[PDB]
Amino acid sequence: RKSITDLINNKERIDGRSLHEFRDISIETGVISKAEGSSRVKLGNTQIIVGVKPQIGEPFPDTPEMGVILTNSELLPMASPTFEPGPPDERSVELSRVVDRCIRESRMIDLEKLCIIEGSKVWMLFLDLHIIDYDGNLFDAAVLATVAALLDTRIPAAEVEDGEVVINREKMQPLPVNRKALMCTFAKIGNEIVLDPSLEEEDILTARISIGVTEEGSICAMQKGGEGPLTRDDVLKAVSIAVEKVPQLIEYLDKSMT
């Protein structure tokens, strides 16, 4: 491990990667036929499947006009020998909330348009993240897969007839997306921040930072992780690359869906 770190202070990484280079990315949609929207993302060997399952229920009392998003992630014993079974641990919860933050705060989905009947009935989007294989950087893979799944989503038209809800699966509609946003995670190793860390790198990092940037280059989510500190320069440097790299990820996504 001593030789992984001394090798990082020069701008070289174990698999030959540049310091600010993502692994090979692979994006498929419409993977689960039963699911209204779904996606499979592979980032290196890190693999995540996301399904979007729309459902009708009550909105939150204080936002009778808002549709609901519910993000949950399953960090599967399958995906890693360090993944315990049972309900979501710390690590799952964080991943899940960070993804939810990115999707929610970017205002990617117009929840107002998910309202069917104000105060009573609204579309509830269950975003379910299924971690299948873990080989480094769950956040970037997760956000990418959720965004992809969301774009893939088609839902039945919900008409209000005489006051009762009616579901016309005749006319399957896409989601009301205002914009897209994606995430870059960096790892502090030695004196350097490294974009998109491998498992080998995640084992030895001092700290990590995830940054969610929107289409118009604004920051919608941020999350420092790890047991070690970051410097002001580290943080601002990471922002700079995220702003730079997200548009490329968005370009890459849009093309995979055509």
Partner: protein, 217 residues
């Protein structure tokens, strides 16, 4: 003497796909596609921790694996399948090379279209072999049943809709030894004997697909 809507004969399986070694982290793994069914299996072990070399198996369904979002977490049906799958797999493994450790078999159903418990065992055995677990034989499973007043093999979704009996069977191919067996619905002892034999034939056919998935090492 009657044809099914999809064109299959009474004793005909839908195209099945098995692929070994697809996961990175798992010691052994397999992906299985059977009709609408999409099943992933991961094997871990043998590994540390007490009377026996037990094999722990978890059958789980993804929330998006079925028509209505299934709240994640275990349910009674999943717990039963996990129980009998561990029992189904056990005779195939030579646990006596390491008689105190555990083997983790994680079966993840990504999409479901009937007959998952069998599919799950079928993929599991491939994952086990792929992990290099010493085995005396493969374990392979398949369901038969009855639908149009006719016992048939590999129940379609539109069929399952209306089905009159399901008969999941898992066997050890070489010896034809039965390792899993259930029945519901309504069969005469004569119908059942037909259901069972038809399922066993399916197992032997599916076994070829298991062996071929491993040859691509």
């Amino acid at each position: 003497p009657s044809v099914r809507e999809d064109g299959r004969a009474f004793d005909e399986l839908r195209p099945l796909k098995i692929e070994a070694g697809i996961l990175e982290r798992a010691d052994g793994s397999s992906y299985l596609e059977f009709g609408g069914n999409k099943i992933l299996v991961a094997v871990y072990g043998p590994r540390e921790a007490p009377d026996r070399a037990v094999i722990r198996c978890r059958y789980n369904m993804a929330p998006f694996s079925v028509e209505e979002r299934k709240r994640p977490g275990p349910d009674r049906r999943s717990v039963e399948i996990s129980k009998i799958t561990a029992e189904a797999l056990r005779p195939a493994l030579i646990l006596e090379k390491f008689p105190r450790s555990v083997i983790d078999v994680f079966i993840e159903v990504l999409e479901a279209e009937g007959g998952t418990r069998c599919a799950g065992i079928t993929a599991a055995s491939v994952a086990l072999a792929d992990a290099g677990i010493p085995m005396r034989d493969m374990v392979v499973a398949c369901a038969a049943g009855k639908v149009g007043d006719q016992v048939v093999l590999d129940l379609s979704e539109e069929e399952d809709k209306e089905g009159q009996a399901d008969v999941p069977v898992a066997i050890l191919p070489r010896t034809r030894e039965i390792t899993l067996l259930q029945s519901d619905g309504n069969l005469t002892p004569e119908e059942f004997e037909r259901a069972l034999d038809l399922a066993v034939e399916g197992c032997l056919r599916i076994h070829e697909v298991q062996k071929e998935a491993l040859r691509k090492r």
